[model samples]
Target: KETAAAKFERQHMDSSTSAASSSNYCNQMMKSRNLTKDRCKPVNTFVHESLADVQAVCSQKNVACKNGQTNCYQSYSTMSITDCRETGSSKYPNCAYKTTQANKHIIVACEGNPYVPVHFDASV
Candidate 1:
C-alpha cells in the first residue's frame, strides 16, 4: 500500500524540473505521471523543491483548509511551483493543460503522528 507521504511525492512533488521551458511540459507530464489516466485533474500543482523543505510545511503556521478544516498549514517561504490548469476545450481521455510556473505560498493539510503533508489545498 502506498502511504500518503509517498503518494504526495508521486502526485505533486517534482524537485528535478525547476522550470518548464517547453510548451509541452504540462501535456507530457500530466499524462506521463498518470494524472490523466481516468479523467483530467482540473487543477494540480507540481512543487519544485526538496522533499525535506516541502515536508517541513507541517511545522509552519496553521491555516484553514479549503473545506474549513483546521489542520492545514501555510508555507512561510514562497515555493517554486507549476500550476497545471485544464483548458476549457479539453476533453476527457485527451486532456490538455496550460502550465504556469510561479513562486507562491502553498496551503496543505497535514496529518498522522509524524505530521506530514497529506493534501494540497491551494497556492497563493
Candidate 2:
C-alpha cells in the first residue's frame, strides 16, 4: 500500500527541474501529477527541494497548522516553491491554475513513527 507520506511526495515534491518558466506550468503539472482528475484541486504547491531536506521539517519545532492541527512543522530555512491556484474559469476534469513562485518556509503536518510529512499546511 502507498503510504500517506509517499502520496504527499508525488503530489507536492518535485526535486528535479522546476519547469516554472511559463503560465502553462500548473495547467500541465496539475494534470501530469494527477492533481487534476475527476475534480480540480483548488490550490496546490510544489517544492523544488530534495526529499531529505523536506523531511527534515518534521524534526524541527512544530506549530499550529492552518487547520488548527498541532502536528505541523515549519521549515527552518526558506526554500524554492510555487503555488498553483485554480482560476474561476476552471472546470472539472480540466483544472486550470495560476502559478505563483516564491521562496518561503514551508509548513507540513507529520505523523507516524518515522515522522514524515503527511499534509501540506502552508508556507510563510
Q: Give the winner by TM-score.
A: 1
Q: State TM-scores per candidate.
A: 0.93, 0.92
Model 2 C-alpha lDDT versus the unseen true structure: 0.89
Residue 115 accuracy (lDDT) in model 2: 88
Q: Candidate 2: where are CA atoms >4 Å away?
A: none
lDDT (tens digit, per residue) of candidate 1 on 12-92: 888896676776778888887789999998888999999889889999979999898999999999999988999999999
Q: Candidate 2's error at 35, in angstroms?
A: 1.1
Q: Give the alpha carbon lDDT tens digit for every residue of 40-75 in model 2.
A: 989999999999999999988689988887999999
Superposed on all Cα atoms, the candidates' RMSDs to the truth, in angstroms, are: 1.2, 1.4
CA lDDT of each candidate?
Answer: 0.89, 0.89
Candidate 1: worst-modelled 10 consecutive residues by lDDT: 17-26
* Alpha-carbon shift of residue 73 in model 1 (angstroms): 0.7
